[PDB]
Design a protein around this ligand. Structure first.
Ligand SMILES: [K+]
Ligand SMILES: [Mg+2]
Ligand SMILES: [Mg+2]
Ligand SMILES: [Mg+2]
Ligand SMILES: [Mg+2]
Ligand SMILES: [Mg+2]
Ligand SMILES: [Zn+2]
Lengths: 56, 122, 119, 115, 229
RNA sequence: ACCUCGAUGUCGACUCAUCUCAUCCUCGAGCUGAAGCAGGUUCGAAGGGUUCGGCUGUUCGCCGAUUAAAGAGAUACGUGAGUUGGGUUCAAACCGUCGUGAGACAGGUUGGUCCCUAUCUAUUGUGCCCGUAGGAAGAUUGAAGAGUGUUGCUUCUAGUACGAGAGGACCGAAGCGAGGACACCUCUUAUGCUCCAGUUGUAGCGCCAGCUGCACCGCUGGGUAGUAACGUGUCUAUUAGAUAAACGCUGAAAGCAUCUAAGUGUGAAACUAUCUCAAAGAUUAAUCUUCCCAUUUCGAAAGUAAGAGCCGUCAAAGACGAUGACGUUGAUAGGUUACAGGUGUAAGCAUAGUGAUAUGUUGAGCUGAGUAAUACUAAUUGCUCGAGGACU
RNA sequence: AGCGAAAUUCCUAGUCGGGUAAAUUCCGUCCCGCUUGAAUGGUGUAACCAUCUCUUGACUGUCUCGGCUAUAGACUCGGUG
RNA sequence: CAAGGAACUCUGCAAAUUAACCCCGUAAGUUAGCGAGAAGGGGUGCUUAUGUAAAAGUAAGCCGCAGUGAAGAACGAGGGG
């Protein structure tokens, strides 16, 4: 099944309205400073005041 | 659930060893006969000294079913082979003697004759 | 379509569980996918709880799961478990392990998670 | 507020029988039935071997398989049912909990009794 | 009319034996006493109804406008509020129990949010039939039939509004009428209904007086045992 | 022979139906060469229902057995971007017949490739944004709508009325069903791949026993939760208004007769409601209740102590989003503990036995999701959006 | 001669018998063979056939009538496109 | 995948049953070779002793729902062109 008429530059742009991205939530790890995405462990390897990994 | 074209044993003395359902009676698309439903059948094997020859269309009352059915009281009566007795036009069997047990659920529909001739009702 | 890979058959899932529990007991940390980690945790906990009594029946029942690793072989890993890992946890009711979420992977944007176990 | 679903079990204690003898799969019991057409309740006895003993409360059920004139009938009763009474005669040896293989085992297939 | 109603949570299903030599399946419904939270009168609000609050909860786990409504109206806080049309014989601030509404063996109807069955296809949804599988009947053989209405501009040239195709099924309200009530239990604030009640084990279940048979009652007793040894 | 040959796919079946009435049944009424039963025909009525099979490529048909009945038609003689290819009609082959011949024949026969990942519209579901002139949470009315509507058999009324006699009811009540629909899983059943037991083979854990992979999950017997039905409950009633055909009461014009002109009625499965569902995006934007908020120093930009979102744990939900519960003041998932249900007497030990193995410890051990407690692990010592009601 | 509604027969779904509850197909049979027919062979024939055609036992999800499970897709996220 | 078991259908297309080895028994018809693996049935596991030179077999005993325990092994009869 093919298009019978080309979908113009107007209909296409409207479809992509819902394609925009979301800014993912960001938290600031305590025990160092940086913006780790929230509910993860930052590159410190420290999650909260507990150690779960190596230096970076 | 005895269905259309279901060969079911005969449990009387009319010499109709094998009989095949031909049209489950009672309303449109009945498509299933439980205990006590009168069906119309056709004999496909007999014995020479028998009052029904091969090919006659007759009517039958089913007594034993393999699927069985849930009774009102909660007991669930289930047999192992399907049986039918051959009736003649009001309630009365064409056979003098009935073989094997017979399910009670014929009692209220009628066929007080068929239950009486039975060895033992269940 | 027709010819297709065997895929995640139930045997694949259970064998992955066995390999990962062997790996986590051997070293003490795993860096895997989150949604395999939440599934490994259950079997991990069940083993460690089944392993606090040390009769030979428990040895048989745990032999059904473990696999040998580069650090420890299976009959070495059993001794390593029952000597130091299992008795360490003998007083904790449940909660033998943790699964914490790492950053998304560059290859697939999967949710890497670390599985470990500490008192 | 909060539920236990031991309430389901609680309401069923309103009708549970007191004795309810215990019998495993392969046992030979007589289950006496009360029947009431109009009056003078007749007791039809129905003896036979048991097959299955499923049940989880007020809904314990059991299968009884009898043979009349070479024709076998299996009948399923509800244990905690008024209008049914159960007596145990012989207790049989068995390795299974639902002996379905008796649907195709004719005469000379009888459980050895238990000591 | 004088419609009577009550709410509960469906706790599960079992069976119980009665006189008349009959086995009766049962649903068990936990009914905490409710509380009228508003009464609508015919003249004042153009209709009549009674607003019932139920599933009592701690004040903390409750939104602020609702807890303010409850404190101002002198009630116990409740998670749920819903109302029944044409309930009249009641006043404000009163506790209502099922024992005070329904006879021992009379006829009710039950509404409940059904069991969400997922995005399901036409043949399970609309009881349609399945194209034959023998004789090699081509790979789309589980479909909604032909949706045709007319070919060519004269005839129909479209699909009819309100067709029958696949979609969402379950998690929608349904009601079973003329289901009798067997018995009660004041100790557990619990009620027994005949038949099978829509909704999952643990949902919310509304009972109203059946419209088909409003006052009709036919008593049904129980089957106390007399076999002990 | 007017569009279509720079292609509008053609018979029949399957699936799905939809619509018309000139009606097959169900319903109401008249006339009868209508005693009763059963009919014959005409009037109104399209709400619903309107079989299964043999033979045939079949429609059509003939025939069997049913049923209340087995309607006539339309929709590109509906429906191949849904299915099939049996038939017609490609090439191969053959009999009959025609032709000297190549070959031909709505004459027959055997065999013979049916493509498409949907852009718009339509439609079924489910959402995002915005609006509804403060902002949010809840509860409502219901304009405009959708869905369902079929019916028999038995008993009594009563062998009463009717009739000579066979035979035999209207009106009405009760019971049991068939088909169709809505849910549910206590019972019966099918399933049920991280459940239980038996069990073959080979290779491994060094050996025995005991286990693991592999073979349709290796095979077989059971099966929790879930999911469905062949299963079990409920429904397919009832009442009211306005009516068509028909019947009228009074009653004239046309001193009588006359259902109509005024007035006043009876009346059907149709119709409008009653019943089930959904519904204020009904921009004609409704109603009620509660909650929160009034500044700034020159329209700004400050932007809630009410709430919503991101994020995490999730299932009563689930295609993704959405719905719904919970986020340390916590029982949302996982784990642990106790239990249910399911399997059905573990492994090891001792006795008998030459041995397979039986017997006692032992209704034992095991157990995915089930029930309920239990903060041990994971739901962070975070982020954003957002109020001053503009005028009559 | 033989054979004959046939791979040949239009009327023809010929008649009759069997099968079948029911049989435009099937087996046998009669013959106004529209136009059968003797090396473009006729008539029989055991074995054989990925051949055709019909009846039948067992057999089964072909079907009354539809259900459940597991995978790979499908659907969602990241990458190429 | 219960009950039914070819009713769907153009046709039993597809799918299903039998399945190796060992022991009985095996019709009509015919070119007298075949038909025929015809049809139709039974046994199969482990232990002990006997078995012969190994083994098949034999008798007794034991377990299971079932013993080429899984996989890989013919479905068949009758008439016609
Ligand atoms: K053309
Ligand atoms: Mg064009
Ligand atoms: Mg997009
Ligand atoms: Mg194809
Ligand atoms: Mg196609
Ligand atoms: Mg992508
Ligand atoms: Zn840091």
């Amino acid at each position: 099944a093919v298009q019978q008429r080309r979908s113009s530059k107007h209909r296409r742009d409207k479809r992509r309205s819902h394609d925009a991205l979301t800014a993912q939530a960001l938290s600031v790890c305590q025990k160092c400073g940086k913006k780790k995405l929230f509910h993860r462990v930052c590159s410190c390897g420290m999650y909260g005041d507990l150690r779960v990994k190596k230096a970076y | 659930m005895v269905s259309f074209m279901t060969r079911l044993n005969v449990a009387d003395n009319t010499g109709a060893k094998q009989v095949g359902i031909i049209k489950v009676l009672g309303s449109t698309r009945k498509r299933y006969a439980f205990l006590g439903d009168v069906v119309v059948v056709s004999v496909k094997d007999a014995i020479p000294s028998g009052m029904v020859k091969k090919g006659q269309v007759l009517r039958a009352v089913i007594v034993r079913t393999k699927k069985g059915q849930q009774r009102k009281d909660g007991t669930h009566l289930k047999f192992d082979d399907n049986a039918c007795v051959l009736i003649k036009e009001d309630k009365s069997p064409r056979g003098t003697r009935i073989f094997g047990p017979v399910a009670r659920e014929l009692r209220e529909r009628g066929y007080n004759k068929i239950l009486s001739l039975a060895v033992e009702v269940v | 379509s027709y010819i297709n890979k065997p895929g995640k058959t139930s045997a694949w899932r259970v064998m992955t569980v066995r390999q990962q529990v062997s790996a986590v007991l051997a070293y003490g940390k795993i860096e895997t996918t989150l949604k395999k980690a939440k599934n490994t945790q259950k079997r991990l906990d069940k083993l460690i709880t089944l392993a606090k009594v040390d009769n030979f029946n428990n040895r048989r029942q745990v032999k059904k799961w473990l696999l040998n690793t580069n650090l420890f072989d299976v009959d070495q890993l059993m001794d390593h478990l029952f000597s130091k890992v299992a008795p360490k946890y003998e007083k904790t009711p449940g909660g033998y392990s943790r699964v914490l979420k790492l950053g998304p992977r560059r290859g697939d944007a999967t949710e890497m998670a670390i599985l470990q176990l500490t008192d | 507020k909060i539920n236990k679903q031991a309430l389901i079990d609680l309401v069923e204690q309103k009708q549970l029988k007191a004795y309810v003898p215990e019998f495993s799969a392969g046992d030979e019991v007589n289950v006496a039935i009360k029947l009431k057409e109009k009056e003078k309740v007749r007791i039809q006895n129905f003896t036979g071997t048991v097959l299955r003993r499923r049940g989880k409360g007020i809904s314990e059920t059991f299968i009884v398989r009898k043979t009349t004139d070479g024709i076998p009938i299996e009948k399923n009763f509800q244990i905690h049912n008024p209008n049914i009474s159960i007596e145990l005669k012989r207790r049989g040896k068995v390795r299974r909990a639902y002996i379905s293989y008796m649907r195709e085992r004719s005469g000379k297939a009888a459980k050895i009794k238990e000591r | 009319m004088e419609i009577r109603g009550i709410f509960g949570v469906k706790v599960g299903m079992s069976q119980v034996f009665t006189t008349n030599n009959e086995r009766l399946p049962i649903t068990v419904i936990y009914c905490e006493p409710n509380q009228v939270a508003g009464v609508k009168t015919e003249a004042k609000d153009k209709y009549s109804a009674t607003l019932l609050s139920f599933d009592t909860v701690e004040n903390k786990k409750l939104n602020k406008p609702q807890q303010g409504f409850f404190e101002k109206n002198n009630l116990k806080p409740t998670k749920h509020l819903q109302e029944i049309r044409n309930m009249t014989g009641f006043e404000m601030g009163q506790q209502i129990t099922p024992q005070n509404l329904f006879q021992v063996g009379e006829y009710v109807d039950v509404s409940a949010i059904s069991k969400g069955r997922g995005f399901t296809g036409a043949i399970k949804r609309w009881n349609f039939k399945i194209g034959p599988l023998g004789h090699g009947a081509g790979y789309p053989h589980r479909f909604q039939g032909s949706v045709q209405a007319g070919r060519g501009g004269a005839s129909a040239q479209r699909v009819f509004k309100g067709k029958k195709m696949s979609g969402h099924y379950g998690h929608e309200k349904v009601t079973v009428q003329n289901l009798r009530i067997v018995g009660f239990d004041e100790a557990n604030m619990l009620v027994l209904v005949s038949g099978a009640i829509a909704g999952p084990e643990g949902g919310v279940v509304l009972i109203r007086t059946a419209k088909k048979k409003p006052g009709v009652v036919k008593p049904i007793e129980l089957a106390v045992q007399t076999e002990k040894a």
